């Protein structure tokens, strides 16, 4: 068909269409957004201590706060 | 830690520079010694002429314009 | 002013090379114009594209993909329009 | 006329390029953040005429934060006075680096 | 007042008078329009840098790209006028009298 | 020209004007004005005569320098108290530069030197679309930024534009120059009452746009450049004559007819202030710019000039022009007299 | 108008930690582990009042905590801490992946001899509570009151009073 | 010491360019069946010394100018570009570490376009003006392509510092995740250096000659940094400098080697070929190298 | 070689604007605008200026003056200085000399303003933790927040393309 | 400009004389320079001596009309001793129109200029006497 007519155009349309589609079937986009969100620019600002809340951990060693563990493990 | 050293250093320049001003301007009429030009009772960030004022060139050129053309 | 020092040294040494090389021995077409304006407009669209590698670290990634594909897609539509409509022919 | 489809559709697509103190992509302030917050809270539920005649003090505070005109005037007066008294010669200056 | 702003505004008046009074060639007028563009670019960029006006720092580059494509349109119009005539003077345009 | 390309260019004119209407950022207003210019340039030079080429050159130069002086005014606004909100400005100098920029954008007395020259060497469709959208696009901006303008600017430009569109206008039989000088006089009227009640300005904008659409549609019904061609239109068809009569008299503004309603409400909500000598001066000049309308009517439908045969030939062909929408606009434009409390339909 | 209230030179004398930059950068994580617990007092003071010249007692507190921490790391293992930071010093901007084996050596020293587990990523994050002794301030933006409210127009609307009330076209 | 750094950069450029002249003459001689230049001393290094000093000796072109100042102002600009374009190039430690260098590369390429256009206008009568006008056209038509491709190959690395590039080249060469994009980039470097197989058929000829060959060595060094190379263990820069020099020399020999055996293109074939074949293909590679790092969970650590 | 280098480069900048506002032949005009753009790049890089001033350099000194000199070469001839051109250059140099003399030896020069006359090391940052060169992340928006702006910009450039081809004989 | 028209109207009228005539000559010189600037912009005299001659003629005539207006203003105000009427400036505008017709050397233009300038000057003093604001309230 047109593969003999204007071939570099057809290849451009093909790679264009797969570049459009391929982020829909993708098991890594949520990984991309978690990586991109979990990098802080400003200072992580503290807060006035507690209304006796079981969150906002006091030592930075305490894993009660939300951390990253899929970073070190690829 | 860097933040605490930075705050102590800028307040150090504020204290010494207003001491210099209080020594130097006792001739002009008017002139309260340490008025902000502003009205609100808030610590404004100074303007690098309140910090690095009358230091005669060398430190202000190595401080303001340092990173701008350091490599 | 450090790169201004480099620029000054290169400029002065180049002028020394030239002046010591000189003191010592003694109509038009529209087709010329269409390519330059095509350069200009696609270069401005390059100027719109080129902060893309600055931007790729944000919390809005699907939207960035969509508008980046929209910019290259518009650039491709302009290209294919002047391609099909005898814009660059001889 | 000015229309209000901006408010009608519920897509606030153009209100973020507008002032400072809307949320930057990394949560950093501008140089005159708090002056803006108090000025906007001064002139919010206001018919833009008692904004002219009532929020004048905080507006002048914000303007002199933004340009720093008269503060530079004071610093320049200090510089000219320092120059003329070092031209005089009284107290060869210990305001630089030492006594 | 950040003293340099006075010089860049005076430079704007320089480029504006160069845009308005212009003797022979339209290309000098268009290039002084470009100089005026550069003046607005530089002036607004120094303002936004010293303000730390960091959210909407788009003004320099976007003002630049828009008024650049304006200059592109001006180049095409000057080429069309020079194509249907011999030269591109301000004269040889006195037809279509007001 | 392709019809798809013309639909695209109309889409971009509408896009630029709607961006001028709808946005709250200054850059977007400047983008809208520039895109309006860029789209309106190839509506002119619709043919390929050099007249349209020189007209488009003059228009592009004045329009671009107006756009850049507008950008100068905005960057002055952010040199002072700086935010991108379309509101009260923060400099009399910036407001001065900005209103002079918009006065270049739309037809004003120091700045009107491009309007008859841009309208003379172009066809009728380009002149219609440029008058409509290039006198609609800055009025929204002036309606926005009215509360920070030195009044002597607007009032001086309004007075001088009304008297220039009056006095310049007694000398041209080029119908495009006649309509252009009429545009200058009416834009002076529509700018004059900006700082008192802008409802009158926008209602006058509606009435003027509908009137000019009727007038240019009547000229597109039978291609004319001079009044003698209008006398030939008298010979070939009688209903066009009474339409020229009614529409020229409604450009004249007589109290039985609907063109008087924008004058009268201006005089009302102008004289509820202490301005009386300025209304009687403006309305004397409104009596002045009726004279070329009246000699045009005398040339068209009331006296009759001698005709040429091959009008005998043109009798055998009934009329076959399409009108976009002539009769609806005509009776909307002329019989609108008892609908004066459709004033308050606007705000 | 109003003059500032600067602190004296008596509060502007803390034993300053006049240490260099690369050693302070390499000694950051365990300083986040053992110390940097009572300096979020200072951080919350700085973010509840935007006013240094006020939170300087807690600045003196973090200054003495960092000096105490470097004293404690100075007295015990390691002395090859010096070898570790001079291994990381001359490498341009200090990437921490540069001298990794000696990082493991310093960690094994401080772990087998003192304790102080290194904070795993990402535990120098993860927003953390802090209680203080001072009560939290109110309105640090020192401004006046919000001057006038607009009376909100409500109430069910009457019809038109005698029509347009223009010249004519009544009703 | 900083002016010593600048002079240790811009003193060996004359050595490099003259020895590149002898190397291109010898390599073309051995692609052909020719030995020599080897009568002028052993293998002819004094042969570039001799013809350089000969062209300095030989009496200049008489003017025949228009704006003497402009006529001198064009080649002074060309040679000061050729000098000021090796500042941010990292062999292991560059002269100036910048926030961004590649846009500076493309900008100085456009200033080379200025050099060509100014020499073309200030040169002579109308025929050389038409020839230089076509030359400016065929030079300016590729800075779309080269900037597009350079953008798409740095998009795998996110930052402009180029020391992040010499970091990210540590594991694999960048020729493997982008071979066709690098190939088209190399063709664009053949376009920017304005050599065979691309046509160009003055004063001072030596200065225009100098700008040409320093542009070639510039593009070769930037290629060798950009697409291949190896690691750099610190406190031993001789290792990376050796491997960098060997790869850049092999690539420059390959460059002249590709020049050696192909006829020059037709001009409308050149524009036709560039637009209708490189430009949709560059767009295809750009959109795929945009949509792919968001696929494969690898967006770069742009600090 | 000293503090007022921003002011001095501004002097050369306004000299360049005078140097092509005197209306020479337009290739001298293109030369003047290239020199003016280079020193404007110098000014904005002195404010730093990390991206935008190198960004203008590719567009105006990379894509616009190229086509201006191109159109000077292909359209107008100007085949052979004058009294009026160099006289306006003299008066522009006189006006700049007068304004900068009154800036130097007095307090302030007022067109209708108060330009506080001294060189600008003020104002500037007080050494903040920038860490990303705020221009860079600012322009690294427009793809998250910038929905409308880049759409209408690209749409305007597309319409510019179809406009140029129509006036230069569409289709 | 506002400063010199304010200097003209600030004089009690009244007699504080010959400052009135100096201010009126300044008004005339300014208005002549305005209209001559438009004329030399829109004519291209060629030679430039003709341009200087035309600007000098316009400034000289407008300054002469201002001077004669101020002279008979002062004289009528001193003689009649009734500073409230507009009839004295009616005489003023007619005298200015007559000398306009004298300096253009035709008499019908002088007669029509007498009539119109007298009516406008009487209206100007009359509106200053009652109080009619410049160009605006601009309130409602």
PDB file of N, CA, C and O in Angstrom, chain F residues 294-325:
ATOM      1  N   UNK F 294     -26.436  64.269   3.592  1.00  0.00           N
ATOM      2  CA  UNK F 294     -27.578  64.866   2.921  1.00  0.00           C
ATOM      3  C   UNK F 294     -27.293  65.112   1.447  1.00  0.00           C
ATOM      4  O   UNK F 294     -28.169  64.903   0.602  1.00  0.00           O
ATOM      5  N   UNK F 295     -26.073  65.545   1.114  1.00  0.00           N
ATOM      6  CA  UNK F 295     -25.734  65.687  -0.298  1.00  0.00           C
ATOM      7  C   UNK F 295     -25.592  64.325  -0.960  1.00  0.00           C
ATOM      8  O   UNK F 295     -25.859  64.198  -2.163  1.00  0.00           O
ATOM      9  N   UNK F 296     -25.249  63.290  -0.188  1.00  0.00           N
ATOM     10  CA  UNK F 296     -25.256  61.942  -0.732  1.00  0.00           C
ATOM     11  C   UNK F 296     -26.677  61.499  -1.055  1.00  0.00           C
ATOM     12  O   UNK F 296     -26.916  60.911  -2.112  1.00  0.00           O
ATOM     13  N   UNK F 297     -27.631  61.807  -0.174  1.00  0.00           N
ATOM     14  CA  UNK F 297     -29.028  61.460  -0.423  1.00  0.00           C
ATOM     15  C   UNK F 297     -29.584  62.219  -1.625  1.00  0.00           C
ATOM     16  O   UNK F 297     -30.316  61.653  -2.452  1.00  0.00           O
ATOM     17  N   UNK F 298     -29.215  63.500  -1.739  1.00  0.00           N
ATOM     18  CA  UNK F 298     -29.560  64.308  -2.903  1.00  0.00           C
ATOM     19  C   UNK F 298     -28.978  63.729  -4.184  1.00  0.00           C
ATOM     20  O   UNK F 298     -29.595  63.810  -5.248  1.00  0.00           O
ATOM     21  N   UNK F 299     -27.788  63.136  -4.098  1.00  0.00           N
ATOM     22  CA  UNK F 299     -27.214  62.498  -5.274  1.00  0.00           C
ATOM     23  C   UNK F 299     -27.888  61.170  -5.592  1.00  0.00           C
ATOM     24  O   UNK F 299     -27.962  60.787  -6.765  1.00  0.00           O
ATOM     25  N   UNK F 300     -28.396  60.459  -4.588  1.00  0.00           N
ATOM     26  CA  UNK F 300     -28.892  59.107  -4.823  1.00  0.00           C
ATOM     27  C   UNK F 300     -30.359  59.067  -5.216  1.00  0.00           C
ATOM     28  O   UNK F 300     -30.693  58.645  -6.325  1.00  0.00           O
ATOM     29  N   UNK F 301     -31.249  59.499  -4.330  1.00  0.00           N
ATOM     30  CA  UNK F 301     -32.630  59.052  -4.453  1.00  0.00           C
ATOM     31  C   UNK F 301     -33.631  60.170  -4.678  1.00  0.00           C
ATOM     32  O   UNK F 301     -34.808  59.881  -4.902  1.00  0.00           O
ATOM     33  N   UNK F 302     -33.215  61.425  -4.611  1.00  0.00           N
ATOM     34  CA  UNK F 302     -34.181  62.512  -4.617  1.00  0.00           C
ATOM     35  C   UNK F 302     -34.076  63.377  -5.862  1.00  0.00           C
ATOM     36  O   UNK F 302     -35.073  63.544  -6.573  1.00  0.00           O
ATOM     37  N   UNK F 303     -32.907  63.920  -6.161  1.00  0.00           N
ATOM     38  CA  UNK F 303     -32.674  64.308  -7.539  1.00  0.00           C
ATOM     39  C   UNK F 303     -32.227  63.080  -8.328  1.00  0.00           C
ATOM     40  O   UNK F 303     -32.024  62.000  -7.773  1.00  0.00           O
ATOM     41  N   UNK F 304     -32.110  63.227  -9.647  1.00  0.00           N
ATOM     42  CA  UNK F 304     -31.750  62.087 -10.478  1.00  0.00           C
ATOM     43  C   UNK F 304     -30.730  62.494 -11.526  1.00  0.00           C
ATOM     44  O   UNK F 304     -30.978  63.407 -12.315  1.00  0.00           O
ATOM     45  N   UNK F 305     -29.634  61.790 -11.566  1.00  0.00           N
ATOM     46  CA  UNK F 305     -28.600  62.101 -12.535  1.00  0.00           C
ATOM     47  C   UNK F 305     -28.908  61.397 -13.849  1.00  0.00           C
ATOM     48  O   UNK F 305     -29.673  60.430 -13.870  1.00  0.00           O
ATOM     49  N   UNK F 306     -28.376  61.877 -14.978  1.00  0.00           N
ATOM     50  CA  UNK F 306     -28.614  61.178 -16.247  1.00  0.00           C
ATOM     51  C   UNK F 306     -27.946  59.816 -16.273  1.00  0.00           C
ATOM     52  O   UNK F 306     -26.879  59.615 -15.696  1.00  0.00           O
ATOM     53  N   UNK F 307     -28.610  58.871 -16.922  1.00  0.00           N
ATOM     54  CA  UNK F 307     -28.200  57.479 -16.899  1.00  0.00           C
ATOM     55  C   UNK F 307     -27.649  57.053 -18.248  1.00  0.00           C
ATOM     56  O   UNK F 307     -27.807  57.733 -19.262  1.00  0.00           O
ATOM     57  N   UNK F 308     -27.009  55.896 -18.239  1.00  0.00           N
ATOM     58  CA  UNK F 308     -26.404  55.320 -19.425  1.00  0.00           C
ATOM     59  C   UNK F 308     -27.163  54.053 -19.779  1.00  0.00           C
ATOM     60  O   UNK F 308     -27.568  53.300 -18.889  1.00  0.00           O
ATOM     61  N   UNK F 309     -27.372  53.819 -21.071  1.00  0.00           N
ATOM     62  CA  UNK F 309     -27.873  52.518 -21.478  1.00  0.00           C
ATOM     63  C   UNK F 309     -26.809  51.444 -21.259  1.00  0.00           C
ATOM     64  O   UNK F 309     -25.635  51.738 -21.022  1.00  0.00           O
ATOM     65  N   UNK F 310     -27.246  50.196 -21.439  1.00  0.00           N
ATOM     66  CA  UNK F 310     -26.846  48.912 -20.863  1.00  0.00           C
ATOM     67  C   UNK F 310     -27.414  48.762 -19.453  1.00  0.00           C
ATOM     68  O   UNK F 310     -27.387  47.660 -18.910  1.00  0.00           O
ATOM     69  N   UNK F 311     -27.981  49.814 -18.866  1.00  0.00           N
ATOM     70  CA  UNK F 311     -28.997  49.612 -17.845  1.00  0.00           C
ATOM     71  C   UNK F 311     -30.238  48.996 -18.455  1.00  0.00           C
ATOM     72  O   UNK F 311     -30.927  48.204 -17.795  1.00  0.00           O
ATOM     73  N   UNK F 312     -30.529  49.345 -19.715  1.00  0.00           N
ATOM     74  CA  UNK F 312     -31.530  48.631 -20.496  1.00  0.00           C
ATOM     75  C   UNK F 312     -31.188  47.154 -20.595  1.00  0.00           C
ATOM     76  O   UNK F 312     -32.078  46.297 -20.572  1.00  0.00           O
ATOM     77  N   UNK F 313     -29.896  46.837 -20.701  1.00  0.00           N
ATOM     78  CA  UNK F 313     -29.487  45.440 -20.701  1.00  0.00           C
ATOM     79  C   UNK F 313     -29.647  44.827 -19.318  1.00  0.00           C
ATOM     80  O   UNK F 313     -30.058  43.668 -19.190  1.00  0.00           O
ATOM     81  N   UNK F 314     -29.326  45.584 -18.271  1.00  0.00           N
ATOM     82  CA  UNK F 314     -29.368  45.047 -16.916  1.00  0.00           C
ATOM     83  C   UNK F 314     -30.795  44.896 -16.399  1.00  0.00           C
ATOM     84  O   UNK F 314     -31.006  44.243 -15.372  1.00  0.00           O
ATOM     85  N   UNK F 315     -31.774  45.475 -17.095  1.00  0.00           N
ATOM     86  CA  UNK F 315     -33.175  45.223 -16.775  1.00  0.00           C
ATOM     87  C   UNK F 315     -33.557  43.760 -16.979  1.00  0.00           C
ATOM     88  O   UNK F 315     -34.384  43.234 -16.230  1.00  0.00           O
ATOM     89  N   UNK F 316     -32.977  43.090 -17.979  1.00  0.00           N
ATOM     90  CA  UNK F 316     -33.380  41.722 -18.281  1.00  0.00           C
ATOM     91  C   UNK F 316     -32.861  40.710 -17.275  1.00  0.00           C
ATOM     92  O   UNK F 316     -33.291  39.555 -17.319  1.00  0.00           O
ATOM     93  N   UNK F 317     -31.943  41.094 -16.398  1.00  0.00           N
ATOM     94  CA  UNK F 317     -31.465  40.201 -15.363  1.00  0.00           C
ATOM     95  C   UNK F 317     -31.983  40.676 -14.023  1.00  0.00           C
ATOM     96  O   UNK F 317     -31.635  41.786 -13.596  1.00  0.00           O
ATOM     97  N   UNK F 318     -32.822  39.905 -13.343  1.00  0.00           N
ATOM     98  CA  UNK F 318     -33.181  40.250 -11.967  1.00  0.00           C
ATOM     99  C   UNK F 318     -31.988  40.083 -11.044  1.00  0.00           C
ATOM    100  O   UNK F 318     -30.991  39.434 -11.377  1.00  0.00           O
ATOM    101  N   UNK F 319     -32.098  40.705  -9.872  1.00  0.00           N
ATOM    102  CA  UNK F 319     -30.982  40.766  -8.940  1.00  0.00           C
ATOM    103  C   UNK F 319     -30.667  39.388  -8.379  1.00  0.00           C
ATOM    104  O   UNK F 319     -31.561  38.594  -8.083  1.00  0.00           O
ATOM    105  N   UNK F 320     -29.372  39.106  -8.252  1.00  0.00           N
ATOM    106  CA  UNK F 320     -28.918  37.781  -7.872  1.00  0.00           C
ATOM    107  C   UNK F 320     -27.749  37.807  -6.891  1.00  0.00           C
ATOM    108  O   UNK F 320     -27.150  36.752  -6.644  1.00  0.00           O
ATOM    109  N   UNK F 321     -27.389  38.974  -6.359  1.00  0.00           N
ATOM    110  CA  UNK F 321     -26.498  39.030  -5.211  1.00  0.00           C
ATOM    111  C   UNK F 321     -27.152  38.346  -4.022  1.00  0.00           C
ATOM    112  O   UNK F 321     -28.367  38.410  -3.837  1.00  0.00           O
ATOM    113  N   UNK F 322     -26.343  37.700  -3.198  1.00  0.00           N
ATOM    114  CA  UNK F 322     -26.819  37.297  -1.890  1.00  0.00           C
ATOM    115  C   UNK F 322     -26.452  38.396  -0.903  1.00  0.00           C
ATOM    116  O   UNK F 322     -25.388  39.015  -1.007  1.00  0.00           O
ATOM    117  N   UNK F 323     -27.385  38.711  -0.021  1.00  0.00           N
ATOM    118  CA  UNK F 323     -27.103  39.562   1.119  1.00  0.00           C
ATOM    119  C   UNK F 323     -26.866  38.655   2.310  1.00  0.00           C
ATOM    120  O   UNK F 323     -27.467  37.581   2.402  1.00  0.00           O
ATOM    121  N   UNK F 324     -25.935  39.055   3.176  1.00  0.00           N
ATOM    122  CA  UNK F 324     -25.661  38.275   4.375  1.00  0.00           C
ATOM    123  C   UNK F 324     -26.894  38.291   5.260  1.00  0.00           C
ATOM    124  O   UNK F 324     -27.540  37.255   5.442  1.00  0.00           O
ATOM    125  N   UNK F 325     -27.241  39.468   5.785  1.00  0.00           N
ATOM    126  CA  UNK F 325     -28.563  39.700   6.356  1.00  0.00           C
ATOM    127  C   UNK F 325     -28.826  41.206   6.284  1.00  0.00           C
ATOM    128  O   UNK F 325     -28.444  41.952   7.185  1.00  0.00           O
TER     129      UNK F 325
END
